[PDB]
Amino acid sequence: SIISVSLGPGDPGLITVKALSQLREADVIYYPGTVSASGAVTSVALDILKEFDLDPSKLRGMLVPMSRGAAEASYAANYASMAEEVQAGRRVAVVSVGDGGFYSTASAIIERARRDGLDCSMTPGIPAFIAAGSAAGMPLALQSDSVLVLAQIDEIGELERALVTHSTVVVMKLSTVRDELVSFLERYAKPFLYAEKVGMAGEFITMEVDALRSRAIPYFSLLVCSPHCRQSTLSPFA
Amino acid sequence: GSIISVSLGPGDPGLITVKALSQLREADVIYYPGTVSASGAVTSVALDILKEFDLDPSKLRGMLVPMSYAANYASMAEEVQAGRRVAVVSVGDGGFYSTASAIIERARRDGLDCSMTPGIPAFIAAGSAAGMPLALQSDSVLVLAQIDEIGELERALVTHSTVVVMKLSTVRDELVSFLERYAKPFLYAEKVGMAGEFITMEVDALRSRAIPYFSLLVCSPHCRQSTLS
Numbered sequence A: 001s002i003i004s005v006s007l008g009p010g011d012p013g014l015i016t017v018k019a020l021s022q023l024r025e026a027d028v029i030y031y032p033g034t035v036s037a038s039g040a041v042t043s044v045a046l047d048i049l050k051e052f053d054l055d056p057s058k059l060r061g062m063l064v065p066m067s068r069g070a071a072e073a074s075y076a077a078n079y080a081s082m083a084e085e086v087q088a089g090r091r092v093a094v095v096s097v098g099d100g101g102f103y104s105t106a107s108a109i110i111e112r113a114r115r116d117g118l119d120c121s122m123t124p125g126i127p128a129f130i131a132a133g134s135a136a137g138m139p140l141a142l143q144s145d146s147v148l149v150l151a152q153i154d155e156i157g158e159l160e161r162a163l164v165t166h167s168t169v170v171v172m173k174l175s176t177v178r179d180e181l182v183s184f185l186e187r188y189a190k191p192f193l194y195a196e197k198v199g200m201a202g203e204f205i206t207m208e209v210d211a212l213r214s215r216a217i218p219y220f221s222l223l224v225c226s227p228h229c230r231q232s233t234l235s236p237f238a
Numbered sequence B: 001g002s003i004i005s006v007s008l009g010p011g012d013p014g015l016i017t018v019k020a021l022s023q024l025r026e027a028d029v030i031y032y033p034g035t036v037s038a039s040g041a042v043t044s045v046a047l048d049i050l051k052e053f054d055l056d057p058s059k060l061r062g063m064l065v066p067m068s069y070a071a072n073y074a075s076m077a078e079e080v081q082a083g084r085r086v087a088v089v090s091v092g093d094g095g096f097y098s099t100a101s102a103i104i105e106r107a108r109r110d111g112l113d114c115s116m117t118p119g120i121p122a123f124i125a126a127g128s129a130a131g132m133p134l135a136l137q138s139d140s141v142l143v144l145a146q147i148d149e150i151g152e153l154e155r156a157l158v159t160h161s162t163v164v165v166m167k168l169s170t171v172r173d174e175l176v177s178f179l180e181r182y183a184k185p186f187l188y189a190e191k192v193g194m195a196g197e198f199i200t201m202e203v204d205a206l207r208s209r210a211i212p213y214f215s216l217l218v219c220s221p222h223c224r225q226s227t228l229s
């Protein structure tokens, strides 16, 4: 069978009991990764998997890099071998950072596993934006709030318009408006959370625009704009 | 001592995080939410989850509300000052329409050591249970809760393609009327991962159906990518 196993967003302790047992029992793994102009691999998913004491030879990397991302194609070029351990009776999981049905490319493997037969399942995980809220010690939503989550916005204008109609707004992937961010956070003169590599080795979370002026805004970062940011341990309002 | 907002996840005990489980097992005292109706019957899905982890039963403290209780802060203040590890639990995630949020704010409002361990929201568990994605490359996701009238949802659905609706009890009588006129893919998800889970993408399955507090609605084109469409 093939199982879409959510890892949670970075802290290995944030994997579910179920997802962890599913990893320990899989015959082969399948994790996404990135190469950044020369080779040498970066994989936030493998960084998590490394803490579970899994057999290193079960893990199958899925690589070509950050772009579109071309991720859709990359997974597709690996499902062929996924419908082969499966026909040979083996347990295949395909891991996702955060949750496997929340902006995950794993959603191509499962949509294709169904229609093709083959016993497939999704085990859910904690979205990054959820873990970010908790890392900052704030609520994301209270009583009747709406929450809007956006991804891959094409220019900062989009965030600005959404921000008068909605309670909380969450913006993911953020190396897309990485150059517009500080100017945006200056206008909008309102509380925000910037959260990078939540639960991972290089975690960085801030509510200070000053702290972002010279910061490189990488793929694994998100923004929360919400009056609830005033409740964070990171806010002067306490 | 200290106080921790521990998220339980949304119902299936296997969906608690390893960390949250560790923290419950180490807690001296665990406070959990529940409701008591006009008749005196108690409902507590948090305790239903808790009863799946082999915790010492004597350490569990109910905080029962009609259906104000943010007042339970003594005994918690009481316990922490005393040196004890207090846990306050939430179904799903504790910062996502959770009333643990009230306790934590009050807790830090005093000197107290507080932290939040996240959990999986029920809308997330629902998409996974149905075998469908909630979001792909560039989609927006809109979550509404306790909408004041059904118009809210219609208005949202024209300008947003994936809309989740949560405390649906405010709008329960209007649901089937709405779905026949929407005439598009949807997921109804009730008590996901709990005894009596019921998941449907069929309007006929909702006609004789009583729609309770722990249900949510996902309206998304992506519901067609499920097994149950």
Ligand SMILES: Nc1ncnc2c1ncn2[C@@H]1O[C@H](CSCC[C@H](N)C(=O)O)[C@@H](O)[C@H]1O
Residues within 6 Å of the ligand: A009, A010, A096, A097, A098, A099, A100, A101, A102, A103, A104, A126, A127, A128, A129, A171, A172, A173, A174, A195, A196, A197, A198, A199, A200, A219, A220, A221, A222
């Ligand atoms: N640990 C983390 N910290 C900050 N952002 C993260 C993150 N993990 C994932 N993200 C966000 O997720 C985007 C990739 S889309 C994948 C989302 C993941 N499936 C989830 O459930 O959250 C990144 O651009 C970033 O905005």
Ligand SMILES: Nc1ncnc2c1ncn2[C@@H]1O[C@H](CSCC[C@H](N)C(=O)O)[C@@H](O)[C@H]1O
Residues within 6 Å of the ligand: B010, B011, B090, B091, B092, B093, B094, B095, B096, B097, B098, B120, B121, B122, B123, B165, B166, B167, B168, B189, B190, B191, B192, B193, B194, B213, B214, B215, B216, B217
């Ligand atoms: N197991 C479950 N199944 C279906 N709906 C659930 C659920 N748990 C919570 N809900 C939804 O959550 C609403 C309560 S507000 C609590 C939300 C919880 N903190 C979370 O993170 O999901 C309910 O009205 C219902 O819409």
